[PDB]
Amino acid sequence: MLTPISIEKEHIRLINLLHFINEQNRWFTIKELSDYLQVADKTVRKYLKLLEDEIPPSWNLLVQKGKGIYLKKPLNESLSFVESKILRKSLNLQICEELVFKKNSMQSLAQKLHLQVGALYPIINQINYDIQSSHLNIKKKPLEISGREQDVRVFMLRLYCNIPNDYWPFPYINKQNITDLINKMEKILNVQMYTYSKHKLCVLFAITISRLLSGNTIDNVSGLILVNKNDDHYKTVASITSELQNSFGVTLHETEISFLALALLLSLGNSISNKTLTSYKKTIMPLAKEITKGIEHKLQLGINYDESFLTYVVLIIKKALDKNFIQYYNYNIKFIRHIKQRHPNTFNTIQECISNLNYTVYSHFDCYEISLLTMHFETQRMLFKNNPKKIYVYTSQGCIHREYISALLEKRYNGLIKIVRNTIINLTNESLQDMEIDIIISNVNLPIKNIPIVQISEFPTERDFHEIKKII
């Protein structure tokens, strides 16, 4: 199965591969590289050609033409130097930036790129085709990408998923003026941000500023994810909004503050931790709820999903969104396929339900996150089908006698039952349901309705064990 790959993400694939080659202290055969990238051996060689020629003299790459290639750079340098070159060269990257940030006609854009219109227009058509799954379009006059504003911005941000930490794609926006504002938010929130995370929050601030400069602003938020206007994160952005409006001559209405605030909050997914997690959970919980409802509707498990099941769903969503604030993606490919072979129908179903969200959300869900959800839900199916019946032991004779009965029930039934040793505060249907009790075994009559009770003697008789057996 060839991996489905697109011309928009070529630069992403090259960067990840280059990183892979370096981390591994081993030889890479041309056959093996051809297969990672999915290209002709001759194309693997054109790339090695650029690589060898663009390495700084500091690094060394070996090629004995029988065992393949080997790359080692010093531990103190980063891959930034070559990574940036890959980006500055990527033609399709430049076109996507043009189409999102700049004024052009077909002919004007063809000019900047030193291309014949008959060379550009097939590429544009392909790009228009590829982005349909993202709910975007390319309109013809002026020549630009269009769609829901937040979808357009995340698209750009996702194409920058693995940019180096010192790579700034906006020459017409001075970085420090964004950095000053972030330093200030970091201070107000009394948190410390990882370098990469921060850089990427700067990049998202600049994507947003550039759009506002071009006339483009958010005029519709779906409700599924809003930063509450009383949250520390909305308010911390609101604090810097005036300095930002004055540095760059833009206007941030409420819904832009909320968006940047969401960005802020997400970039703190990891920081070098309490009130953060809480805003995180309140903000994402409604999405976790819609996802769960979506999937349940197709899987028909019949379960009620409790709050800690939904908290894991927030966790997985968080892993998804954090990809913007961590440079390099870890692979897991074997792990993923094992999950996919074990639960193929469930895997596809969840893929479908995630793909019916907004692009803002499903842009971040790959096979791995889907495999995460797949395990999450299949775990419930096993627990609901295999968990033993929970039993509450009620006795007029006090707690020593309660325990003694409890051990007798266990001696007899082992794993067909689970004794609930906590003392129930009262006998209302709510107190029983919040201990998830299925069966009460009592030596006393009780005013209780909708839940099997087996009245037994103060020491169970064989008749008692027989009644209990039936309803277990």
Ligand X SMILES: CCCCCCCCCCCCO[C@@H]1O[C@H](CO)[C@@H](O[C@H]2O[C@H](CO)[C@@H](O)[C@H](O)[C@H]2O)[C@H](O)[C@H]1O
Site residues (CB under 6 A) for ligand X, limited to 120-139: none
**Choosing among ligand X, its own copies, none, which partner's interface includes residue 254 (Cβ < 5 to 8 Å by kind)?**
none
Rounded least distance, CB 40 to its own copies, Å: 4
Site residues (CB under 8 A) for its own copies, limited to 330-369: 352, 356
Side-chain half-sphere exposure of 20, counting CA atoms within 13 A: 16
| 266 backbone φψ class: left, alpha, beta (φ>0; ψ -120 to 50) | alpha
Among 5, 62, 399, 407, binds its own copies (CB under 8 A): 5
Question: For residues 40 and 444, which CB has a smaller minimum distance to its own copies in the complex?
Answer: 40
User: Closest residue (Cβ) to ligand X?
Assistant: 85
Applying CB under 8 A, does 219 fall inside the site for its own copies? Answer: no
Beta bridge partners, 71, equal 61
Site residues (CB under 8 A) for its own copies, limited to 292-311: 297
Rounded Cα gap, residues 416 and 2, in angstroms: 48
For β-strands 453-455 and 439-442, DSSP reports them as parallel
Rounded least distance, CB 119 to its own copies, Å: 8
Question: For residues 71 and 124, which CB has a smaller minimum distance to ligand X in the complex?
Answer: 71
Question: For residues 5 and 62, which CB has a smaller minimum distance to its own copies in the complex?
Answer: 5
| Helix-, strand-, coil-residue percentages of the chain, each rounded to 5 | 60, 5, 35
Site residues (CB under 8 A) for its own copies, limited to 220-259: none
Rounded least distance, CB 43 to its own copies, Å: 5
**Choosing among its own copies, ligand X, none, which partner's interface includes residue 137 (Cβ < 5 to 8 Å by kind)?**
its own copies
Q: In this chain, which stretch among 36-44, 71-79, 313-321, 435-443 interacts with its own copies, using CB under 8 A?
A: 36-44
Site residues (CB under 6 A) for ligand X, limited to 389-428: none
Among 7, 48, 213, 221, binds ligand X (CB under 6 A): 48
Q: In this chain, which stretch among 79-87, 121-129, 322-330, 399-407 interacts with its own copies, using CB under 8 A?
A: 121-129
Among 12, 79, 82, 161, binds ligand X (CB under 6 A): 82
Rounded least distance, CB 93 to ligand X, Å: 12
Classify residue 167 by burial, with Cβ atoms within 10 Å: 0-12, 13-18, 19+: middle
Give, in order, the Cα–Cα distances in Å from 68 to each of 19, 28, 32, 302. 17, 5, 9, 55
Torsion sign (Cα): 400, 402, 404, 406: negative
Rounded Cα gap, residues 167 and 81, in angstroms: 10
Which residue is listed with tokens 């993202």? 134
Applying CB under 8 A, does 111 fall inside the site for its own copies? Answer: no
Applying CB under 6 A, does 14 fall inside the site for ligand X? Answer: yes
DSSP state of 460: -
Rounded least distance, CB 126 to its own copies, Å: 7
Rounded Cα gap, residues 459 and 408, in angstroms: 9
Question: For residues 31 and 103, which CB has a smaller minimum distance to ligand X in the complex?
Answer: 31
Rounded Cα gap, residues 403 and 420, in angstroms: 11
Rounded Cα gap, residues 183 and 239, in angstroms: 12
Give, in order, the Cα–Cα distances in Å from 278 to each of 59, 269, 297, 376. 45, 11, 28, 22
Rounded least distance, CB 2 to ligand X, Å: 18
Applying CB under 8 A, does 177 fall inside the site for its own copies? Answer: no
Exposure class string for 20-30: b at 16+ Cβ within 10 A, else e:
ebeeeeebbeb
**Interface size with its own copies, residues (CB under 8 A):** 35
Cβ contacts of 94 within 8 Å, gap of 6 or more: 113
Query: End-to-end distance of the chain based on CA atoms, in angstroms?
Result: 48
SS3 52: helix
Residues that bind ligand X (CB under 6 A): 14, 17-18, 21, 33, 44, 47-48, 50-51, 54, 82, 85-86, 89
Residues that bind its own copies (CB under 8 A): 1-7, 38-43, 116-118, 121-122, 124-126, 128-130, 132-133, 137-141, 146, 297, 352, 356
